[PDB]
Amino acid sequence: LVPRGSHMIIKPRVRGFICVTTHPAGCAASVREQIAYVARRGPIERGPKKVLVIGASTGYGLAARIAAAFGAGAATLGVFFERAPADAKPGTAGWYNSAAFHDEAAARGLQATSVNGDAFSDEIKHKTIDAIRRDLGQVDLVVYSVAAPRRTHPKTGVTHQSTLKPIGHAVRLRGIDTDNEAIKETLLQPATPDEIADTVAVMGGEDWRMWIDALDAAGVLADGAKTTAFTYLGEQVTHDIYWNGSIGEAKKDLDRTVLALRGKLAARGGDARVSVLKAVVTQASSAIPMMPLYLSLLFKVMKARGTHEGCIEQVDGLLRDSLYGAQPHVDAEGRLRADRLELDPAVQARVLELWDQVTDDNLYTLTDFAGYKAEFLRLFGFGIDGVDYDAPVEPNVRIPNLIE
């Protein structure tokens, strides 16, 4: 408000597949909209009171932190990995999201602590444990929502890289080049055994298990505690990659991991579940196989049915209907499901029918590619209602008592 040169006019800048700018005011307004959504259905009674969210700064993890805090009234500890604002170079979106979370939480009286560092590392587990002991005593819910392309193993020091490839045979997948805004095909060779192993190391359940084991050993997991890890399964359109490919092997590891975790927690009346959520735009969406095309089509079809929604709607429902509801949506493997609207048969049929019909010429009219691009920019604080993008904004935003 004070006319300061330190305030910046920040416009979206997409280079290749990533947005290199971030709007602090837009991020905060987005956090406020999510808080407002949770307030629509009011309080979440009989919910968790002391919640750890691993991967708490963006997407589903941020939505979980918001629903738990502003919905259930829970104190929260969030772990994330974000860049702080520095020498007039703004931070990452997740930084501003978490700062805004902190501001809103502080105003309401909801206790909030955050840890910024590599959640895969022992040092961060140790610091998070100390913070729980200091602020919470014990946690009654642990949400695991980490989506990292690589993992430096805490024991071996090996850096594992995740790969999105089919298994057994090559596949050829239609998609959108979001940079050139055109249809393309990507030929993907079958994953090697090393690629499969590395993908499991990054995206499977080992780190989640290490978290639970360490929390429990330190005595900071409450009797009756629940833990859930978020994932995506989708349906036929993307199954070669997201269900049967290298990523599928990581998800199978999550399913195996949760059975042991559940056995561990069930003794004291707790539980562990994999929760399956719908497809949404994420920061990595534009670079990964199939997704911009699949999302553009899915958005078109679900908007037409009035069932389109994003992270906060999904997670608020998951918490109310299933994780803390008396009639949870459960599948054959025992996963909690929030993705029913995506799996609607008429929805899947329409996406499938349109899949091979998209061309360079009809990209914008046959799909909701505009909506994909708008939701991509929302991740970085752009295009949010009520924000004046012509007004200068302060990049240097602090997070109180951040642990690093």
In total, how many domains does the chain have? 1
Closest to 102 in 3D by CA, of 31, 38, 44: 31
DSSP state for residue 265 in the 8-state scheme? H
Q: Could you give the C-alpha distances from 58 to 36, 94, 99, 124, in angstroms and in order?
A: 17, 5, 12, 19
DSSP 266-283: HTTT-EEEEEE------T
CB 66 within 8 A of CB 101: yes
Helix H or strand E encompassing 112: strand 112-116
Residue 143, domain extent: 1-404
Q: How far apart are CA 223 and CA 215, in angstroms?
A: 12
CB 372 within 8 A of CB 295: yes
Kindly report the CATH number assigned to the domain that includes residue 386.
Answer: 3.40.50.720
Mention every residue, 6+ apart, whose C-beta is less than 8 A from residue 232: 242, 276, 277, 278, 279, 339
Give me the amino acid identity at 6: S
| Torsion 100-316-237-358 (CA) sign | negative
Q: How far apart are CA 61 and CA 114, in angstroms?
A: 13
Reported as half-sphere exposure (CB side, CA atoms, 13 A), residue 392 has a value of 10
Q: How far apart are CA 319 and CA 54, in angstroms?
A: 16
Q: How far apart are CA 196 and CA 387, in angstroms?
A: 44
| Torsion 258-259-260-261 (CA) sign | positive
Q: How far apart are CA 206 and CA 217, in angstroms?
A: 16
Q: Is 364 one of the annotated active-site residues of the chain?
A: no
Residue 184, strand partner residues:
175
DSSP state for residue 191 in the 8-state scheme? P
Q: How many helices (H) and strands (E) does the chain have?
A: 14, 13
Tokens 């975790």 locate to 261
CB 295 within 8 A of CB 281: yes
Q: Which of 37, 144, 232, 242 is catalytic?
A: 242
Please write down the long-range contacts of 33-42, taking CB distance under 8 Å and 24 or more positions apart: 33/312, 33/384, 33/385, 34/62, 34/63, 34/66, 34/311, 34/312, 35/66, 35/70, 35/104, 37/312, 37/313, 37/316, 38/66, 38/67, 38/70, 38/71, 38/312, 38/316, 39/70, 41/71, 41/316, 41/320
Q: How far apart are CA 272 and CA 254, in angstroms?
A: 11
CB 360 within 8 A of CB 175: no
Distance from chain centroid for Cα 300: 22
| Rg value, the chain, Cα | 21
Please write down the long-range contacts of 83-91, taking CB distance under 8 Å and 24 or more positions apart: 84/116, 85/395, 85/396, 85/397, 88/6, 88/8, 88/395, 88/396, 89/395, 90/8, 90/10, 90/21, 90/22, 90/24, 90/395, 91/22, 91/24, 91/395, 91/397
Q: How far apart are CA 38 and CA 65, in angstroms?
A: 11
Mention every residue, 6+ apart, whose C-beta is less than 8 A from residue 2: none
CB 360 within 8 A of CB 53: no
Bridge-based pairing state of the strands 182-188 and 171-177: antiparallel
Q: How far apart are CA 403 and CA 115, in angstroms?
A: 5
Q: How far apart are CA 228 and CA 272, in angstroms?
A: 6
Helix H or strand E encompassing 127: helix 122-135
Q: How far apart are CA 97 and CA 260, in angstroms?
A: 34
CB 362 within 8 A of CB 356: no
Structure tokens at 316: 């608020």
Closest to 50 in 3D by CA, of 80, 73, 79, 67: 73
CB 165 within 8 A of CB 187: no
Residue 275, strand partner residues:
230, 336
| Vertex 29 angle, CA 111 and 69, to 5° | 25
* Method of determination used here: X-ray
Which residues sit directly before a break in the chain (C to N > 2.5 Å)?
none
Mention every residue, 6+ apart, whose C-beta is less than 8 A from residue 353: none
Bridge-based pairing state of the strands 75-80 and 50-54: parallel
Q: How far apart are CA 92 and CA 84, in angstroms?
A: 7
